[PDB]
Amino acid sequence: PRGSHMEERLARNALEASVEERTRDLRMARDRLETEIADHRQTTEKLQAVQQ
Amino acid sequence: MEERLARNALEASVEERTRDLRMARDRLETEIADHRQTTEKLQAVQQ
């Protein structure tokens, strides 16, 4: 006993799960990298201030 | 001179971090762009 769009909804669930998990991974990578860039910016700004 | 060598080593370290962070940024930019085109194509095949 199957709905007329059951297979299509299951395919949608599969694709959605994968795409959203990739999205979370890329958000996390982006977060880590922004934090590193901020550390680097603080470091360079402070070293610039003391160079003269 | 010791202070000059230490200075240059720190300078070199900082320039290296700049290069690595730019490489990482460029790569993640491409990854994000590619993912976005996947999501847009996904979304349009439904509607």
mmCIF file of N, CA, C and O in Angstrom:
data_model
loop_
_atom_site.group_PDB
_atom_site.id
_atom_site.type_symbol
_atom_site.label_atom_id
_atom_site.label_comp_id
_atom_site.label_asym_id
_atom_site.label_seq_id
_atom_site.Cartn_x
_atom_site.Cartn_y
_atom_site.Cartn_z
ATOM 1 N N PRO A 1 0.845 -1.202 0.000
ATOM 2 C CA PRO A 1 0.000 0.000 0.000
ATOM 3 C C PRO A 1 0.875 1.246 0.000
ATOM 4 O O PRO A 1 1.429 1.593 1.042
ATOM 5 N N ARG A 2 0.997 1.907 -1.147
ATOM 6 C CA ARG A 2 1.957 2.998 -1.299
ATOM 7 C C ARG A 2 1.267 4.243 -1.835
ATOM 8 O O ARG A 2 0.379 4.153 -2.692
ATOM 9 N N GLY A 3 1.653 5.393 -1.316
ATOM 10 C CA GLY A 3 1.207 6.654 -1.860
ATOM 11 C C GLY A 3 1.746 6.905 -3.253
ATOM 12 O O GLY A 3 2.806 6.405 -3.636
ATOM 13 N N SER A 4 1.006 7.701 -4.019
ATOM 14 C CA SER A 4 1.363 8.024 -5.400
ATOM 15 C C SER A 4 2.655 8.837 -5.547
ATOM 16 O O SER A 4 3.179 8.931 -6.644
ATOM 17 N N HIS A 5 3.166 9.400 -4.450
ATOM 18 C CA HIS A 5 4.447 10.140 -4.498
ATOM 19 C C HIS A 5 5.443 9.671 -3.435
ATOM 20 O O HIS A 5 6.414 10.374 -3.097
ATOM 21 N N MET A 6 5.209 8.474 -2.909
ATOM 22 C CA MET A 6 6.082 7.879 -1.889
ATOM 23 C C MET A 6 7.541 7.756 -2.308
ATOM 24 O O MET A 6 8.436 8.175 -1.551
ATOM 25 N N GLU A 7 7.807 7.178 -3.485
ATOM 26 C CA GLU A 7 9.200 7.013 -3.910
ATOM 27 C C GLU A 7 9.853 8.381 -4.101
ATOM 28 O O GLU A 7 11.016 8.615 -3.681
ATOM 29 N N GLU A 8 9.109 9.323 -4.661
ATOM 30 C CA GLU A 8 9.692 10.637 -4.920
ATOM 31 C C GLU A 8 10.034 11.351 -3.616
ATOM 32 O O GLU A 8 11.121 12.010 -3.519
ATOM 33 N N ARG A 9 9.154 11.230 -2.617
ATOM 34 C CA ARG A 9 9.423 11.808 -1.277
ATOM 35 C C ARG A 9 10.594 11.131 -0.589
ATOM 36 O O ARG A 9 11.380 11.802 0.111
ATOM 37 N N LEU A 10 10.720 9.813 -0.725
ATOM 38 C CA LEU A 10 11.893 9.164 -0.149
ATOM 39 C C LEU A 10 13.194 9.626 -0.828
ATOM 40 O O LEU A 10 14.219 9.829 -0.161
ATOM 41 N N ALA A 11 13.152 9.805 -2.152
ATOM 42 C CA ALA A 11 14.344 10.296 -2.878
ATOM 43 C C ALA A 11 14.678 11.704 -2.396
ATOM 44 O O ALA A 11 15.871 12.058 -2.197
ATOM 45 N N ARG A 12 13.632 12.503 -2.194
ATOM 46 C CA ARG A 12 13.801 13.882 -1.693
ATOM 47 C C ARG A 12 14.431 13.911 -0.316
ATOM 48 O O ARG A 12 15.366 14.721 -0.064
ATOM 49 N N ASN A 13 13.976 13.037 0.569
ATOM 50 C CA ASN A 13 14.544 12.911 1.906
ATOM 51 C C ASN A 13 16.027 12.551 1.841
ATOM 52 O O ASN A 13 16.834 13.083 2.621
ATOM 53 N N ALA A 14 16.367 11.613 0.948
ATOM 54 C CA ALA A 14 17.773 11.193 0.806
ATOM 55 C C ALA A 14 18.692 12.348 0.359
ATOM 56 O O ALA A 14 19.763 12.658 0.988
ATOM 57 N N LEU A 15 18.268 12.997 -0.724
ATOM 58 C CA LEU A 15 19.030 14.123 -1.262
ATOM 59 C C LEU A 15 19.158 15.257 -0.261
ATOM 60 O O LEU A 15 20.257 15.845 -0.092
ATOM 61 N N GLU A 16 18.056 15.578 0.404
ATOM 62 C CA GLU A 16 18.041 16.641 1.413
ATOM 63 C C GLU A 16 19.005 16.344 2.555
ATOM 64 O O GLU A 16 19.812 17.232 2.987
ATOM 65 N N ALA A 17 18.975 15.108 3.042
ATOM 66 C CA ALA A 17 19.864 14.719 4.140
ATOM 67 C C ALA A 17 21.324 14.978 3.750
ATOM 68 O O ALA A 17 22.079 15.602 4.522
ATOM 69 N N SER A 18 21.685 14.514 2.546
ATOM 70 C CA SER A 18 23.068 14.681 2.074
ATOM 71 C C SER A 18 23.460 16.158 1.871
ATOM 72 O O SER A 18 24.527 16.613 2.362
ATOM 73 N N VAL A 19 22.627 16.912 1.164
ATOM 74 C CA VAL A 19 22.917 18.317 0.876
ATOM 75 C C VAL A 19 23.026 19.176 2.145
ATOM 76 O O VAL A 19 23.937 20.009 2.275
ATOM 77 N N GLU A 20 22.128 18.953 3.098
ATOM 78 C CA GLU A 20 22.140 19.708 4.342
ATOM 79 C C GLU A 20 23.334 19.316 5.196
ATOM 80 O O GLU A 20 23.886 20.173 5.898
ATOM 81 N N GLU A 21 23.748 18.048 5.137
ATOM 82 C CA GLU A 21 24.924 17.660 5.910
ATOM 83 C C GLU A 21 26.185 18.316 5.324
ATOM 84 O O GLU A 21 27.043 18.832 6.073
ATOM 85 N N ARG A 22 26.280 18.329 3.993
ATOM 86 C CA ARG A 22 27.377 19.065 3.332
ATOM 87 C C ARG A 22 27.384 20.558 3.710
ATOM 88 O O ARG A 22 28.458 21.145 4.007
ATOM 89 N N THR A 23 26.198 21.167 3.726
ATOM 90 C CA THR A 23 26.040 22.553 4.160
ATOM 91 C C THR A 23 26.596 22.740 5.568
ATOM 92 O O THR A 23 27.435 23.618 5.777
ATOM 93 N N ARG A 24 26.176 21.913 6.529
ATOM 94 C CA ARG A 24 26.725 22.020 7.898
ATOM 95 C C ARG A 24 28.237 21.915 7.915
ATOM 96 O O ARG A 24 28.906 22.670 8.646
ATOM 97 N N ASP A 25 28.785 20.971 7.149
ATOM 98 C CA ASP A 25 30.250 20.825 7.120
ATOM 99 C C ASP A 25 30.918 22.097 6.609
ATOM 100 O O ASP A 25 31.968 22.499 7.127
ATOM 101 N N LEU A 26 30.322 22.726 5.593
ATOM 102 C CA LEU A 26 30.947 23.905 4.976
ATOM 103 C C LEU A 26 30.780 25.144 5.866
ATOM 104 O O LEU A 26 31.663 25.979 5.926
ATOM 105 N N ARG A 27 29.646 25.258 6.563
ATOM 106 C CA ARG A 27 29.493 26.264 7.616
ATOM 107 C C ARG A 27 30.533 26.090 8.708
ATOM 108 O O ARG A 27 31.096 27.079 9.186
ATOM 109 N N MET A 28 30.810 24.852 9.107
ATOM 110 C CA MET A 28 31.769 24.649 10.179
ATOM 111 C C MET A 28 33.177 25.018 9.694
ATOM 112 O O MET A 28 33.955 25.651 10.429
ATOM 113 N N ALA A 29 33.505 24.605 8.472
ATOM 114 C CA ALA A 29 34.820 24.927 7.904
ATOM 115 C C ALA A 29 34.975 26.431 7.780
ATOM 116 O O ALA A 29 36.057 27.017 8.095
ATOM 117 N N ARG A 30 33.907 27.078 7.342
ATOM 118 C CA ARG A 30 33.906 28.530 7.222
ATOM 119 C C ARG A 30 34.127 29.202 8.576
ATOM 120 O O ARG A 30 34.919 30.160 8.678
ATOM 121 N N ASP A 31 33.459 28.695 9.612
ATOM 122 C CA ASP A 31 33.639 29.210 10.980
ATOM 123 C C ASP A 31 35.083 29.095 11.440
ATOM 124 O O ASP A 31 35.679 30.087 11.934
ATOM 125 N N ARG A 32 35.646 27.889 11.312
ATOM 126 C CA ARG A 32 37.045 27.694 11.713
ATOM 127 C C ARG A 32 37.956 28.696 10.990
ATOM 128 O O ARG A 32 38.837 29.348 11.620
ATOM 129 N N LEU A 33 37.745 28.846 9.685
ATOM 130 C CA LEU A 33 38.630 29.697 8.883
ATOM 131 C C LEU A 33 38.485 31.177 9.220
ATOM 132 O O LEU A 33 39.499 31.879 9.335
ATOM 133 N N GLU A 34 37.252 31.647 9.401
ATOM 134 C CA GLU A 34 37.030 33.012 9.887
ATOM 135 C C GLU A 34 37.737 33.265 11.230
ATOM 136 O O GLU A 34 38.304 34.337 11.431
ATOM 137 N N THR A 35 37.676 32.298 12.145
ATOM 138 C CA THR A 35 38.364 32.448 13.441
ATOM 139 C C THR A 35 39.862 32.574 13.234
ATOM 140 O O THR A 35 40.514 33.448 13.860
ATOM 141 N N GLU A 36 40.406 31.729 12.354
ATOM 142 C CA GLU A 36 41.856 31.834 12.030
ATOM 143 C C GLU A 36 42.255 33.165 11.390
ATOM 144 O O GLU A 36 43.339 33.715 11.674
ATOM 145 N N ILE A 37 41.409 33.674 10.503
ATOM 146 C CA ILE A 37 41.676 34.936 9.822
ATOM 147 C C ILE A 37 41.619 36.076 10.824
ATOM 148 O O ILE A 37 42.434 37.005 10.778
ATOM 149 N N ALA A 38 40.670 36.004 11.752
ATOM 150 C CA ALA A 38 40.589 37.021 12.803
ATOM 151 C C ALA A 38 41.836 37.032 13.694
ATOM 152 O O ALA A 38 42.332 38.106 14.036
ATOM 153 N N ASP A 39 42.324 35.846 14.062
ATOM 154 C CA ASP A 39 43.552 35.711 14.895
ATOM 155 C C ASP A 39 44.720 36.337 14.135
ATOM 156 O O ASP A 39 45.562 37.094 14.713
ATOM 157 N N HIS A 40 44.796 36.003 12.849
ATOM 158 C CA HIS A 40 45.878 36.502 11.996
ATOM 159 C C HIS A 40 45.844 38.029 11.845
ATOM 160 O O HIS A 40 46.897 38.720 11.884
ATOM 161 N N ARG A 41 44.644 38.567 11.726
ATOM 162 C CA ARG A 41 44.429 39.998 11.619
ATOM 163 C C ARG A 41 44.808 40.729 12.911
ATOM 164 O O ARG A 41 45.520 41.746 12.876
ATOM 165 N N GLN A 42 44.351 40.225 14.053
ATOM 166 C CA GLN A 42 44.784 40.799 15.328
ATOM 167 C C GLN A 42 46.308 40.796 15.430
ATOM 168 O O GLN A 42 46.936 41.789 15.833
ATOM 169 N N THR A 43 46.905 39.663 15.076
ATOM 170 C CA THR A 43 48.355 39.511 15.181
ATOM 171 C C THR A 43 49.086 40.523 14.314
ATOM 172 O O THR A 43 50.043 41.207 14.787
ATOM 173 N N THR A 44 48.666 40.627 13.056
ATOM 174 C CA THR A 44 49.336 41.509 12.086
ATOM 175 C C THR A 44 49.116 42.980 12.433
ATOM 176 O O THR A 44 50.034 43.799 12.306
ATOM 177 N N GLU A 45 47.901 43.314 12.863
ATOM 178 C CA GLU A 45 47.590 44.686 13.263
ATOM 179 C C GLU A 45 48.445 45.119 14.455
ATOM 180 O O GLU A 45 48.994 46.236 14.462
ATOM 181 N N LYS A 46 48.554 44.246 15.453
ATOM 182 C CA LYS A 46 49.366 44.563 16.623
ATOM 183 C C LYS A 46 50.847 44.631 16.285
ATOM 184 O O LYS A 46 51.535 45.529 16.754
ATOM 185 N N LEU A 47 51.337 43.725 15.444
ATOM 186 C CA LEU A 47 52.760 43.797 15.049
ATOM 187 C C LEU A 47 53.045 45.054 14.231
ATOM 188 O O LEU A 47 54.142 45.651 14.337
ATOM 189 N N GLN A 48 52.076 45.475 13.418
ATOM 190 C CA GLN A 48 52.227 46.719 12.656
ATOM 191 C C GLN A 48 52.342 47.936 13.581
ATOM 192 O O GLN A 48 53.155 48.847 13.340
ATOM 193 N N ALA A 49 51.578 47.912 14.668
ATOM 194 C CA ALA A 49 51.513 49.039 15.591
ATOM 195 C C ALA A 49 52.837 49.214 16.319
ATOM 196 O O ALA A 49 53.220 50.340 16.666
ATOM 197 N N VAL A 50 53.539 48.110 16.554
ATOM 198 C CA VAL A 50 54.805 48.199 17.307
ATOM 199 C C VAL A 50 56.068 48.283 16.454
ATOM 200 O O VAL A 50 57.171 48.417 16.989
ATOM 201 N N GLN A 51 55.911 48.240 15.136
ATOM 202 C CA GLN A 51 57.055 48.237 14.227
ATOM 203 C C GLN A 51 57.695 49.614 14.115
ATOM 204 O O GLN A 51 58.877 49.732 13.792
ATOM 205 N N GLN A 52 56.907 50.642 14.421
ATOM 206 C CA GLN A 52 57.426 51.996 14.572
ATOM 207 C C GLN A 52 56.685 52.731 15.695
ATOM 208 O O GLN A 52 55.885 52.134 16.428
ATOM 209 N N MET B 1 72.977 39.889 13.337
ATOM 210 C CA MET B 1 72.572 40.395 14.645
ATOM 211 C C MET B 1 71.365 39.593 15.130
ATOM 212 O O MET B 1 70.466 39.269 14.346
ATOM 213 N N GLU B 2 71.348 39.265 16.418
ATOM 214 C CA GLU B 2 70.308 38.389 16.960
ATOM 215 C C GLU B 2 68.899 38.960 16.849
ATOM 216 O O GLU B 2 67.964 38.237 16.475
ATOM 217 N N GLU B 3 68.730 40.234 17.195
ATOM 218 C CA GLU B 3 67.395 40.829 17.142
ATOM 219 C C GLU B 3 66.895 40.931 15.704
ATOM 220 O O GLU B 3 65.690 40.776 15.439
ATOM 221 N N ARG B 4 67.817 41.194 14.779
ATOM 222 C CA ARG B 4 67.456 41.250 13.364
ATOM 223 C C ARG B 4 67.016 39.875 12.823
ATOM 224 O O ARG B 4 66.039 39.766 12.068
ATOM 225 N N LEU B 5 67.725 38.821 13.216
ATOM 226 C CA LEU B 5 67.348 37.486 12.761
ATOM 227 C C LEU B 5 66.002 37.069 13.359
ATOM 228 O O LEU B 5 65.165 36.516 12.649
ATOM 229 N N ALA B 6 65.793 37.343 14.648
ATOM 230 C CA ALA B 6 64.498 37.012 15.269
ATOM 231 C C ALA B 6 63.355 37.782 14.617
ATOM 232 O O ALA B 6 62.277 37.215 14.365
ATOM 233 N N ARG B 7 63.586 39.068 14.353
ATOM 234 C CA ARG B 7 62.616 39.871 13.609
ATOM 235 C C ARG B 7 62.248 39.206 12.292
ATOM 236 O O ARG B 7 61.060 38.992 11.985
ATOM 237 N N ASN B 8 63.267 38.876 11.503
ATOM 238 C CA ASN B 8 63.004 38.331 10.180
ATOM 239 C C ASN B 8 62.277 36.988 10.274
ATOM 240 O O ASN B 8 61.457 36.668 9.411
ATOM 241 N N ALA B 9 62.570 36.206 11.308
ATOM 242 C CA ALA B 9 61.924 34.904 11.452
ATOM 243 C C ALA B 9 60.453 35.109 11.742
ATOM 244 O O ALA B 9 59.600 34.408 11.190
ATOM 245 N N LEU B 10 60.141 36.076 12.600
ATOM 246 C CA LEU B 10 58.728 36.349 12.889
ATOM 247 C C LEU B 10 58.015 36.837 11.622
ATOM 248 O O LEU B 10 56.930 36.353 11.283
ATOM 249 N N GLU B 11 58.641 37.777 10.908
ATOM 250 C CA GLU B 11 58.126 38.281 9.628
ATOM 251 C C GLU B 11 57.826 37.150 8.632
ATOM 252 O O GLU B 11 56.770 37.135 7.968
ATOM 253 N N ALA B 12 58.761 36.211 8.530
ATOM 254 C CA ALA B 12 58.602 35.054 7.648
ATOM 255 C C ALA B 12 57.421 34.181 8.071
ATOM 256 O O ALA B 12 56.673 33.695 7.223
ATOM 257 N N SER B 13 57.280 33.973 9.380
ATOM 258 C CA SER B 13 56.162 33.209 9.926
ATOM 259 C C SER B 13 54.808 33.823 9.595
ATOM 260 O O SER B 13 53.841 33.101 9.250
ATOM 261 N N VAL B 14 54.719 35.136 9.764
ATOM 262 C CA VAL B 14 53.508 35.883 9.441
ATOM 263 C C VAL B 14 53.154 35.835 7.950
ATOM 264 O O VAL B 14 51.966 35.581 7.573
ATOM 265 N N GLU B 15 54.158 35.987 7.091
ATOM 266 C CA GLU B 15 53.911 35.924 5.646
ATOM 267 C C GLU B 15 53.457 34.517 5.231
ATOM 268 O O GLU B 15 52.622 34.350 4.319
ATOM 269 N N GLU B 16 54.020 33.510 5.896
ATOM 270 C CA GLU B 16 53.609 32.131 5.649
ATOM 271 C C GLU B 16 52.146 31.906 6.040
ATOM 272 O O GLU B 16 51.377 31.299 5.276
ATOM 273 N N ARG B 17 51.753 32.364 7.227
ATOM 274 C CA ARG B 17 50.344 32.280 7.625
ATOM 275 C C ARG B 17 49.414 33.001 6.640
ATOM 276 O O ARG B 17 48.301 32.511 6.347
ATOM 277 N N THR B 18 49.834 34.161 6.140
ATOM 278 C CA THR B 18 49.041 34.879 5.142
ATOM 279 C C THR B 18 48.796 34.010 3.905
ATOM 280 O O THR B 18 47.645 33.851 3.443
ATOM 281 N N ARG B 19 49.879 33.425 3.397
ATOM 282 C CA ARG B 19 49.806 32.564 2.217
ATOM 283 C C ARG B 19 48.895 31.358 2.446
ATOM 284 O O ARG B 19 48.056 31.032 1.582
ATOM 285 N N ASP B 20 49.057 30.689 3.586
ATOM 286 C CA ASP B 20 48.208 29.520 3.873
ATOM 287 C C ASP B 20 46.750 29.899 4.033
ATOM 288 O O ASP B 20 45.842 29.162 3.573
ATOM 289 N N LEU B 21 46.487 31.010 4.709
ATOM 290 C CA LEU B 21 45.087 31.418 4.921
ATOM 291 C C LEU B 21 44.407 31.818 3.615
ATOM 292 O O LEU B 21 43.230 31.465 3.386
ATOM 293 N N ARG B 22 45.134 32.513 2.742
ATOM 294 C CA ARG B 22 44.637 32.821 1.396
ATOM 295 C C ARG B 22 44.355 31.559 0.563
ATOM 296 O O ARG B 22 43.320 31.483 -0.113
ATOM 297 N N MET B 23 45.247 30.569 0.628
ATOM 298 C CA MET B 23 45.027 29.300 -0.085
ATOM 299 C C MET B 23 43.773 28.588 0.425
ATOM 300 O O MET B 23 42.938 28.091 -0.380
ATOM 301 N N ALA B 24 43.648 28.538 1.754
ATOM 302 C CA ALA B 24 42.485 27.903 2.401
ATOM 303 C C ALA B 24 41.171 28.608 2.060
ATOM 304 O O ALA B 24 40.142 27.947 1.768
ATOM 305 N N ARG B 25 41.201 29.938 2.109
ATOM 306 C CA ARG B 25 40.083 30.789 1.696
ATOM 307 C C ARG B 25 39.682 30.534 0.251
ATOM 308 O O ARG B 25 38.521 30.273 -0.022
ATOM 309 N N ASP B 26 40.640 30.569 -0.665
ATOM 310 C CA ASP B 26 40.353 30.346 -2.086
ATOM 311 C C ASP B 26 39.655 28.997 -2.299
ATOM 312 O O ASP B 26 38.653 28.895 -3.043
ATOM 313 N N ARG B 27 40.188 27.973 -1.638
ATOM 314 C CA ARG B 27 39.656 26.619 -1.796
ATOM 315 C C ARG B 27 38.245 26.493 -1.240
ATOM 316 O O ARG B 27 37.365 25.849 -1.850
ATOM 317 N N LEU B 28 38.018 27.091 -0.080
ATOM 318 C CA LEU B 28 36.699 26.995 0.553
ATOM 319 C C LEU B 28 35.674 27.804 -0.218
ATOM 320 O O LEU B 28 34.504 27.383 -0.337
ATOM 321 N N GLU B 29 36.093 28.948 -0.751
ATOM 322 C CA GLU B 29 35.277 29.737 -1.687
ATOM 323 C C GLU B 29 34.788 28.887 -2.868
ATOM 324 O O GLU B 29 33.597 28.920 -3.210
ATOM 325 N N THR B 30 35.703 28.130 -3.472
ATOM 326 C CA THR B 30 35.313 27.265 -4.576
ATOM 327 C C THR B 30 34.350 26.183 -4.096
ATOM 328 O O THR B 30 33.346 25.907 -4.770
ATOM 329 N N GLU B 31 34.645 25.578 -2.946
ATOM 330 C CA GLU B 31 33.760 24.508 -2.416
ATOM 331 C C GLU B 31 32.343 25.014 -2.170
ATOM 332 O O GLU B 31 31.353 24.332 -2.490
ATOM 333 N N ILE B 32 32.249 26.198 -1.581
ATOM 334 C CA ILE B 32 30.970 26.818 -1.281
ATOM 335 C C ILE B 32 30.201 27.136 -2.560
ATOM 336 O O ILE B 32 29.001 26.813 -2.658
ATOM 337 N N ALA B 33 30.889 27.710 -3.546
ATOM 338 C CA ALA B 33 30.285 28.019 -4.846
ATOM 339 C C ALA B 33 29.742 26.756 -5.534
ATOM 340 O O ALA B 33 28.612 26.733 -6.075
ATOM 341 N N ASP B 34 30.543 25.696 -5.504
ATOM 342 C CA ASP B 34 30.122 24.436 -6.106
ATOM 343 C C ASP B 34 28.904 23.884 -5.376
ATOM 344 O O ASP B 34 27.960 23.401 -6.021
ATOM 345 N N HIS B 35 28.917 23.945 -4.043
ATOM 346 C CA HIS B 35 27.763 23.418 -3.280
ATOM 347 C C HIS B 35 26.497 24.211 -3.595
ATOM 348 O O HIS B 35 25.395 23.654 -3.701
ATOM 349 N N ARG B 36 26.662 25.523 -3.735
ATOM 350 C CA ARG B 36 25.536 26.396 -4.032
ATOM 351 C C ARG B 36 24.927 26.053 -5.386
ATOM 352 O O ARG B 36 23.703 26.015 -5.542
ATOM 353 N N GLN B 37 25.767 25.780 -6.374
ATOM 354 C CA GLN B 37 25.181 25.429 -7.652
ATOM 355 C C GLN B 37 24.449 24.078 -7.602
ATOM 356 O O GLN B 37 23.447 23.894 -8.291
ATOM 357 N N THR B 38 24.904 23.166 -6.748
ATOM 358 C CA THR B 38 24.194 21.905 -6.515
ATOM 359 C C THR B 38 22.823 22.154 -5.897
ATOM 360 O O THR B 38 21.809 21.596 -6.344
ATOM 361 N N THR B 39 22.796 22.987 -4.857
ATOM 362 C CA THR B 39 21.548 23.281 -4.156
ATOM 363 C C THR B 39 20.525 23.974 -5.061
ATOM 364 O O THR B 39 19.339 23.639 -5.018
ATOM 365 N N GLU B 40 20.987 24.911 -5.891
ATOM 366 C CA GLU B 40 20.125 25.627 -6.841
ATOM 367 C C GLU B 40 19.541 24.714 -7.913
ATOM 368 O O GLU B 40 18.397 24.892 -8.347
ATOM 369 N N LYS B 41 20.334 23.744 -8.358
ATOM 370 C CA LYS B 41 19.879 22.784 -9.370
ATOM 371 C C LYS B 41 18.920 21.776 -8.759
ATOM 372 O O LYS B 41 17.979 21.319 -9.416
ATOM 373 N N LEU B 42 19.167 21.432 -7.501
ATOM 374 C CA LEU B 42 18.310 20.538 -6.732
ATOM 375 C C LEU B 42 16.937 21.162 -6.619
ATOM 376 O O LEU B 42 15.918 20.541 -6.913
ATOM 377 N N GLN B 43 16.935 22.414 -6.182
ATOM 378 C CA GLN B 43 15.714 23.153 -5.906
ATOM 379 C C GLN B 43 14.865 23.369 -7.157
ATOM 380 O O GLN B 43 13.635 23.268 -7.096
ATOM 381 N N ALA B 44 15.503 23.634 -8.296
ATOM 382 C CA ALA B 44 14.759 23.885 -9.533
ATOM 383 C C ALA B 44 14.155 22.633 -10.183
ATOM 384 O O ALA B 44 13.193 22.746 -10.946
ATOM 385 N N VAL B 45 14.703 21.452 -9.907
ATOM 386 C CA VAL B 45 14.135 20.236 -10.496
ATOM 387 C C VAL B 45 12.835 19.827 -9.808
ATOM 388 O O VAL B 45 12.074 19.022 -10.335
ATOM 389 N N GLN B 46 12.582 20.389 -8.631
ATOM 390 C CA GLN B 46 11.393 20.041 -7.865
ATOM 391 C C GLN B 46 10.205 20.875 -8.321
ATOM 392 O O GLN B 46 9.223 20.348 -8.858
ATOM 393 N N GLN B 47 10.343 22.185 -8.111
ATOM 394 C CA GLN B 47 9.348 23.176 -8.497
ATOM 395 C C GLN B 47 9.162 23.254 -10.009
ATOM 396 O O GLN B 47 9.307 22.259 -10.718
#
